[PDB]
Design an enzyme around this catalytic site. Structure first.
Site, PDB file in Angstrom:
ATOM      1  N   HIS A 120      43.281  15.923  52.012  1.00  0.00           N
ATOM      2  CA  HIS A 120      44.371  17.198  52.405  1.00  0.00           C
ATOM      3  C   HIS A 120      44.419  18.468  51.646  1.00  0.00           C
ATOM      4  CE1 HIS A 120      48.084  15.529  50.533  1.00  0.00           C
ATOM      5  NE2 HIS A 120      48.385  16.981  50.455  1.00  0.00           N
ATOM      6  N   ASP A 167      43.490   9.662  53.901  1.00  0.00           N
ATOM      7  CA  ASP A 167      43.634  10.960  52.943  1.00  0.00           C
ATOM      8  C   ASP A 167      43.093  10.613  51.656  1.00  0.00           C
ATOM      9  OD1 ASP A 167      44.520  13.385  52.102  1.00  0.00           O
ATOM     10  OD2 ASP A 167      46.640  12.811  52.311  1.00  0.00           O
ATOM     11  N   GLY A 227      52.931  19.274  45.353  1.00  0.00           N
ATOM     12  CA  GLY A 227      51.986  19.513  44.211  1.00  0.00           C
ATOM     13  C   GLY A 227      51.577  18.324  43.515  1.00  0.00           C
ATOM     14  N   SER A 270      50.111  15.806  45.198  1.00  0.00           N
ATOM     15  CA  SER A 270      48.999  15.143  46.119  1.00  0.00           C
ATOM     16  C   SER A 270      47.834  14.966  45.358  1.00  0.00           C
ATOM     17  CB  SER A 270      48.910  16.279  47.184  1.00  0.00           C
ATOM     18  OG  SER A 270      49.939  16.319  48.167  1.00  0.00           O
ATOM     19  N   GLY A 271      47.323  13.754  45.687  1.00  0.00           N
ATOM     20  CA  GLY A 271      46.126  13.438  45.166  1.00  0.00           C
ATOM     21  C   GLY A 271      45.898  12.843  43.841  1.00  0.00           C
TER      22      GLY A 271
HETATM   23  O1  LIG Z   1      53.772  18.350  50.930  1.00  0.00           O
HETATM   24  C1  LIG Z   1      54.862  17.721  50.825  1.00  0.00           C
HETATM   25  O2  LIG Z   1      56.073  17.982  51.275  1.00  0.00           O
HETATM   26  C2  LIG Z   1      54.848  16.290  50.193  1.00  0.00           C
HETATM   27  C3  LIG Z   1      53.848  15.508  49.806  1.00  0.00           C
HETATM   28  C4  LIG Z   1      54.543  14.238  49.378  1.00  0.00           C
HETATM   29  C5  LIG Z   1      53.831  13.124  48.900  1.00  0.00           C
HETATM   30  C6  LIG Z   1      54.593  11.897  48.750  1.00  0.00           C
HETATM   31 CL1  LIG Z   1      53.803  10.413  48.333  1.00  0.00          CL
HETATM   32  C7  LIG Z   1      55.873  12.071  48.752  1.00  0.00           C
HETATM   33  C8  LIG Z   1      56.440  13.394  49.267  1.00  0.00           C
HETATM   34  C9  LIG Z   1      55.766  14.248  49.495  1.00  0.00           C
HETATM   35  N1  LIG Z   1      56.035  15.485  50.092  1.00  0.00           N
END
Ligand SMILES: O=C(O)c1cc2cc(Cl)ccc2[nH]1
Ligand SMILES: [Ca+2]
Lengths: 55, 251
Positions: free
Chosen positions: B41, B90, B187, B189-190
Protein backbone atom coordinates in the site's frame (compact mmCIF):
# COMPACT_ATOMS: atom_id res chain seq x y z
CA UNK A 1 9.22 -34.40 15.88
CA UNK A 2 9.42 -30.82 14.42
CA UNK A 3 5.82 -29.89 15.47
CA UNK A 4 6.70 -30.43 19.18
CA UNK A 5 8.98 -27.70 20.69
CA UNK A 6 10.59 -27.18 17.20
CA UNK A 7 12.07 -30.74 17.38
CA UNK A 8 14.58 -29.33 19.90
CA UNK A 9 16.13 -27.18 17.08
CA UNK A 10 17.43 -23.66 17.77
CA UNK A 11 16.36 -22.64 14.21
CA UNK A 12 14.89 -24.83 11.39
CA UNK A 13 13.66 -28.44 11.67
CA UNK A 14 13.11 -31.11 8.95
CA UNK A 15 11.19 -34.37 9.63
CA UNK A 16 12.56 -37.53 7.99
CA UNK A 17 11.26 -41.09 7.23
CA UNK A 18 11.02 -42.67 10.69
CA UNK A 19 11.73 -41.03 14.09
CA UNK A 20 14.62 -39.16 12.24
CA UNK A 21 14.97 -35.34 12.60
CA UNK A 22 17.50 -32.88 11.08
CA UNK A 23 18.00 -29.34 12.45
CA UNK A 24 19.20 -26.67 10.01
CA UNK A 25 20.34 -23.05 10.22
CA UNK A 26 19.79 -19.81 8.28
CA UNK A 27 22.72 -18.68 6.02
CA UNK A 28 25.58 -17.13 7.98
CA UNK A 29 25.17 -19.89 10.67
CA UNK A 30 26.50 -23.47 11.11
CA UNK A 31 24.98 -26.33 13.07
CA UNK A 32 26.98 -27.51 16.11
CA UNK A 33 27.85 -31.23 16.80
CA UNK A 34 24.93 -31.30 19.30
CA UNK A 35 22.82 -31.25 16.11
CA UNK A 36 20.45 -28.53 17.46
CA UNK A 37 22.51 -25.31 18.08
CA UNK A 38 23.40 -22.71 15.46
CA UNK A 39 26.58 -20.69 15.67
CA UNK A 40 27.33 -17.52 13.53
CA UNK A 41 29.87 -18.06 10.70
CA UNK A 42 29.96 -14.32 9.74
CA UNK A 43 30.58 -11.00 11.43
CA UNK A 44 26.96 -9.78 10.95
CA UNK A 45 24.57 -12.77 11.09
CA UNK A 46 20.86 -12.01 10.53
CA UNK A 47 18.62 -11.34 13.56
CA UNK A 48 21.47 -10.55 16.01
CA UNK A 49 22.10 -7.03 17.41
CA UNK A 50 25.86 -6.25 17.39
CA UNK A 51 25.78 -3.57 20.13
CA UNK A 52 23.97 -6.06 22.45
CA UNK A 53 26.19 -9.04 21.35
CA UNK A 54 29.40 -6.97 21.97
CA UNK A 55 28.39 -6.25 25.63
CA UNK B 1 4.26 4.27 17.00
CA UNK B 2 1.81 5.14 19.85
CA UNK B 3 2.86 4.49 23.47
CA UNK B 4 6.27 2.95 22.75
CA UNK B 5 9.77 4.20 23.47
CA UNK B 6 12.81 5.40 21.56
CA UNK B 7 14.62 2.32 20.09
CA UNK B 8 18.22 2.86 21.46
CA UNK B 9 20.50 3.69 18.45
CA UNK B 10 21.61 0.44 16.76
CA UNK B 11 19.02 -1.80 18.51
CA UNK B 12 16.68 -2.08 15.42
CA UNK B 13 19.51 -2.44 12.78
CA UNK B 14 17.22 -4.01 10.15
CA UNK B 15 14.83 -0.98 10.23
CA UNK B 16 14.52 0.71 6.83
CA UNK B 17 13.26 4.24 6.16
CA UNK B 18 11.68 4.74 2.70
CA UNK B 19 11.77 8.22 1.08
CA UNK B 20 10.09 9.64 -2.04
CA UNK B 21 11.65 12.99 -3.18
CA UNK B 22 13.31 13.17 0.30
CA UNK B 23 9.94 13.00 2.14
CA UNK B 24 9.14 10.16 4.61
CA UNK B 25 7.03 7.49 2.88
CA UNK B 26 7.04 4.23 4.92
CA UNK B 27 9.20 1.77 6.80
CA UNK B 28 10.70 -1.50 5.63
CA UNK B 29 12.86 -4.42 6.80
CA UNK B 30 16.28 -5.36 5.49
CA UNK B 31 16.39 -9.17 5.02
CA UNK B 32 19.88 -9.41 3.35
CA UNK B 33 22.30 -6.90 1.71
CA UNK B 34 20.07 -6.09 -1.36
CA UNK B 35 16.48 -6.97 -0.33
CA UNK B 36 13.96 -5.04 1.72
CA UNK B 37 10.43 -6.17 2.69
CA UNK B 38 7.74 -3.42 2.97
CA UNK B 39 3.92 -3.03 2.45
CA UNK B 40 2.37 -2.87 -1.05
CA UNK B 41 0.00 0.00 0.00
CA UNK B 42 3.13 2.29 0.44
CA UNK B 43 3.35 2.43 -3.38
CA UNK B 44 -0.33 3.15 -4.34
CA UNK B 45 0.38 6.86 -5.07
CA UNK B 46 3.96 6.75 -6.42
CA UNK B 47 4.52 8.48 -9.82
CA UNK B 48 8.21 9.43 -9.27
CA UNK B 49 9.48 5.76 -9.28
CA UNK B 50 13.12 7.00 -9.89
CA UNK B 51 13.03 9.12 -6.64
CA UNK B 52 12.44 6.19 -4.23
CA UNK B 53 15.26 5.86 -1.66
CA UNK B 54 15.87 3.32 1.16
CA UNK B 55 17.88 4.50 4.17
CA UNK B 56 19.60 1.93 6.51
CA UNK B 57 21.32 2.66 9.82
CA UNK B 58 18.94 5.59 10.36
CA UNK B 59 18.03 6.64 13.90
CA UNK B 60 17.52 10.43 14.32
CA UNK B 61 16.02 12.28 11.30
CA UNK B 62 17.35 15.71 12.39
CA UNK B 63 21.06 14.82 12.20
CA UNK B 64 23.44 12.92 9.87
CA UNK B 65 25.82 10.90 12.10
CA UNK B 66 27.67 8.92 9.37
CA UNK B 67 26.00 5.50 10.05
CA UNK B 68 23.18 6.14 7.52
CA UNK B 69 23.37 4.33 4.16
CA UNK B 70 21.13 5.50 1.28
CA UNK B 71 20.33 3.33 -1.74
CA UNK B 72 18.06 3.84 -4.73
CA UNK B 73 15.28 1.27 -5.02
CA UNK B 74 15.84 -0.59 -8.35
CA UNK B 75 12.64 -2.69 -8.19
CA UNK B 76 9.33 -2.86 -6.23
CA UNK B 77 7.68 -6.32 -6.46
CA UNK B 78 4.03 -6.68 -5.52
CA UNK B 79 1.89 -9.89 -5.53
CA UNK B 80 -0.66 -10.11 -8.40
CA UNK B 81 -3.42 -10.61 -5.79
CA UNK B 82 -2.83 -7.17 -4.16
CA UNK B 83 -5.46 -4.59 -5.26
CA UNK B 84 -4.50 -0.86 -4.79
CA UNK B 85 -6.55 0.94 -2.13
CA UNK B 86 -7.30 -2.38 -0.34
CA UNK B 87 -5.68 -4.26 2.60
CA UNK B 88 -5.26 -7.94 1.53
CA UNK B 89 -1.79 -9.24 0.34
CA UNK B 90 -0.15 -6.08 1.71
CA UNK B 91 3.50 -6.89 0.95
CA UNK B 92 6.25 -5.56 -1.35
CA UNK B 93 9.74 -6.86 -1.99
CA UNK B 94 12.30 -4.19 -2.86
CA UNK B 95 15.59 -4.70 -4.65
CA UNK B 96 18.27 -2.08 -3.80
CA UNK B 97 20.37 -0.71 -6.73
CA UNK B 98 23.63 -1.55 -4.84
CA UNK B 99 24.05 -3.69 -1.66
CA UNK B 100 24.17 -1.97 1.74
CA UNK B 101 27.36 -2.59 3.80
CA UNK B 102 26.68 -4.60 6.99
CA UNK B 103 28.01 -2.77 10.07
CA UNK B 104 27.08 -2.60 13.81
CA UNK B 105 24.20 -0.29 12.69
CA UNK B 106 22.97 -2.11 9.55
CA UNK B 107 22.07 -5.78 10.00
CA UNK B 108 19.36 -7.85 8.26
CA UNK B 109 16.47 -9.50 10.05
CA UNK B 110 16.11 -13.30 9.42
CA UNK B 111 13.36 -14.15 6.92
CA UNK B 112 12.35 -17.52 8.50
CA UNK B 113 11.29 -20.77 6.80
CA UNK B 114 7.48 -21.15 6.45
CA UNK B 115 7.17 -24.29 8.72
CA UNK B 116 9.33 -22.81 11.49
CA UNK B 117 7.27 -19.55 11.28
CA UNK B 118 3.87 -21.32 11.30
CA UNK B 119 4.49 -23.96 13.96
CA UNK B 120 6.87 -22.08 16.29
CA UNK B 121 7.13 -18.26 15.69
CA UNK B 122 3.34 -17.86 15.37
CA UNK B 123 3.11 -18.96 19.07
CA UNK B 124 5.62 -16.44 20.51
CA UNK B 125 3.23 -14.01 22.31
CA UNK B 126 5.11 -10.71 22.11
CA UNK B 127 6.95 -9.16 19.16
CA UNK B 128 8.42 -5.70 18.44
CA UNK B 129 7.00 -3.15 15.91
CA UNK B 130 9.01 -0.07 15.03
CA UNK B 131 9.06 3.11 12.91
CA UNK B 132 9.17 6.91 12.64
CA UNK B 133 5.37 7.11 12.41
CA UNK B 134 2.92 9.28 14.31
CA UNK B 135 3.29 9.31 18.07
CA UNK B 136 -0.50 9.88 18.31
CA UNK B 137 -3.58 9.49 16.16
CA UNK B 138 -3.78 12.88 14.22
CA UNK B 139 -0.34 13.77 15.71
CA UNK B 140 3.18 14.59 14.47
CA UNK B 141 5.68 11.84 13.30
CA UNK B 142 8.71 10.86 15.46
CA UNK B 143 12.21 12.34 14.90
CA UNK B 144 13.84 9.27 16.59
CA UNK B 145 13.05 5.62 15.79
CA UNK B 146 10.37 4.23 18.12
CA UNK B 147 9.72 0.62 19.18
CA UNK B 148 6.73 -1.08 20.80
CA UNK B 149 6.19 -4.63 22.22
CA UNK B 150 2.83 -6.02 21.08
CA UNK B 151 1.09 -9.37 21.80
CA UNK B 152 -0.29 -11.45 18.90
CA UNK B 153 -3.92 -12.64 18.91
CA UNK B 154 -5.61 -15.65 17.32
CA UNK B 155 -7.91 -14.21 14.57
CA UNK B 156 -11.08 -15.66 16.32
CA UNK B 157 -10.13 -13.69 19.50
CA UNK B 158 -9.35 -10.50 17.44
CA UNK B 159 -12.82 -10.61 15.72
CA UNK B 160 -14.59 -11.38 19.07
CA UNK B 161 -12.63 -8.74 21.17
CA UNK B 162 -13.06 -6.01 18.49
CA UNK B 163 -15.86 -3.35 18.40
CA UNK B 164 -17.72 -1.04 6.14
CA UNK B 165 -14.66 -2.36 8.12
CA UNK B 166 -12.24 -4.77 6.31
CA UNK B 167 -12.24 -8.52 7.07
CA UNK B 168 -9.22 -10.25 8.69
CA UNK B 169 -7.97 -12.80 6.12
CA UNK B 170 -5.49 -15.73 6.35
CA UNK B 171 -2.88 -13.29 4.89
CA UNK B 172 -3.11 -11.14 8.08
CA UNK B 173 -2.89 -11.31 11.87
CA UNK B 174 -3.90 -9.03 14.76
CA UNK B 175 -1.52 -7.70 17.39
CA UNK B 176 -1.64 -5.08 20.09
CA UNK B 177 -4.07 -3.71 22.67
CA UNK B 178 -7.74 -2.69 22.66
CA UNK B 179 -7.49 -0.02 25.48
CA UNK B 180 -6.35 2.77 23.08
CA UNK B 181 -2.85 3.19 24.57
CA UNK B 182 -0.39 1.31 22.27
CA UNK B 183 -0.29 0.65 18.53
CA UNK B 184 1.64 1.15 15.33
CA UNK B 185 0.51 4.14 13.19
CA UNK B 186 0.01 5.44 9.58
CA UNK B 187 3.69 6.34 8.94
CA UNK B 188 4.99 3.04 10.44
CA UNK B 189 3.42 1.11 7.46
CA UNK B 190 5.78 -1.41 5.88
CA UNK B 191 7.93 -1.64 9.01
CA UNK B 192 8.90 -4.86 10.84
CA UNK B 193 6.90 -6.95 13.32
CA UNK B 194 9.97 -8.87 14.64
CA UNK B 195 9.85 -12.02 16.85
CA UNK B 196 12.62 -13.25 19.18
CA UNK B 197 13.26 -17.03 19.35
CA UNK B 198 16.23 -18.67 21.09
CA UNK B 199 18.61 -15.69 20.79
CA UNK B 200 17.65 -14.65 17.22
CA UNK B 201 15.10 -12.22 15.67
CA UNK B 202 12.81 -13.10 12.75
CA UNK B 203 10.40 -11.35 10.40
CA UNK B 204 6.78 -12.38 11.21
CA UNK B 205 4.70 -9.40 10.17
CA UNK B 206 4.57 -6.12 8.24
CA UNK B 207 2.82 -2.98 9.66
CA UNK B 208 -0.26 -2.95 7.42
CA UNK B 209 -3.54 -1.31 8.62
CA UNK B 210 -5.99 -0.46 11.43
CA UNK B 211 -8.99 1.78 12.28
CA UNK B 212 -7.09 5.02 13.06
CA UNK B 213 -4.15 4.65 15.53
CA UNK B 214 -4.67 3.19 19.04
CA UNK B 215 -8.54 3.30 18.67
CA UNK B 216 -10.38 1.77 21.70
CA UNK B 217 -11.68 -1.74 20.89
CA UNK B 218 -9.33 -2.12 17.88
CA UNK B 219 -5.97 -3.89 17.28
CA UNK B 220 -3.21 -3.36 14.67
CA UNK B 221 -3.42 -5.61 11.56
CA UNK B 222 -0.13 -7.05 10.20
CA UNK B 223 0.67 -8.92 6.96
CA UNK B 224 1.23 -12.60 7.81
CA UNK B 225 4.72 -12.91 6.27
CA UNK B 226 4.71 -16.80 6.66
CA UNK B 227 2.21 -16.99 3.75
CA UNK B 228 4.76 -15.24 1.44
CA UNK B 229 8.08 -17.02 2.28
CA UNK B 230 8.17 -19.19 -0.89
CA UNK B 231 6.97 -16.26 -3.07
CA UNK B 232 9.77 -14.03 -1.60
CA UNK B 233 12.45 -16.76 -1.93
CA UNK B 234 11.65 -17.46 -5.61
CA UNK B 235 11.83 -13.72 -6.42
CA UNK B 236 15.16 -13.27 -4.62
CA UNK B 237 16.62 -16.12 -6.77
CA UNK B 238 15.49 -14.38 -10.01
CA UNK B 239 17.19 -11.94 -12.38
CA UNK B 240 16.21 -8.23 -12.28
CA UNK B 241 13.80 -6.99 -15.01
CA UNK B 242 13.51 -3.53 -16.65
CA UNK B 243 11.05 -1.10 -15.00
CA UNK B 244 10.80 -0.32 -11.26
CA UNK B 245 7.35 -1.74 -10.54
CA UNK B 246 6.87 -5.51 -11.09
CA UNK B 247 3.67 -7.45 -10.41
CA UNK B 248 4.50 -11.13 -9.73
CA UNK B 249 2.01 -14.02 -9.59
CA UNK B 250 0.90 -15.15 -6.15
CA UNK B 251 1.05 -18.02 -5.08
O1 LIG C 1 -2.98 4.62 8.13
C1 LIG C 1 -3.49 4.37 9.32
O2 LIG C 1 -4.41 5.01 9.82
C2 LIG C 1 -2.92 3.18 9.99
C3 LIG C 1 -2.03 2.22 9.58
C4 LIG C 1 -1.86 1.30 10.68
C5 LIG C 1 -1.18 0.10 10.85
C6 LIG C 1 -1.30 -0.58 12.04
CL1 LIG C 1 -0.53 -2.14 12.20
C7 LIG C 1 -2.06 -0.09 13.09
C8 LIG C 1 -2.74 1.11 12.95
C9 LIG C 1 -2.65 1.79 11.74
N1 LIG C 1 -3.29 2.93 11.30
CA1 LIG D 1 20.26 10.54 11.13
Amino acid sequence: ICVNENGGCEQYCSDHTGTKRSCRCHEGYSLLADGVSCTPTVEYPCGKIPILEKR
Amino acid sequence: IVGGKVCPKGECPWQVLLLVNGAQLCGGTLINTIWVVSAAHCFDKIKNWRNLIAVLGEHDLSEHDGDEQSRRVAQVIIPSTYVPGTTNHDIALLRLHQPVVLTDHVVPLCLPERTFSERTLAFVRFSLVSGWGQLLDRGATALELMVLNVPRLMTQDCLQQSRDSPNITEYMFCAGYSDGSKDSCKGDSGGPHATHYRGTWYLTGIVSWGQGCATVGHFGVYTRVSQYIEWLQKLMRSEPRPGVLLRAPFP
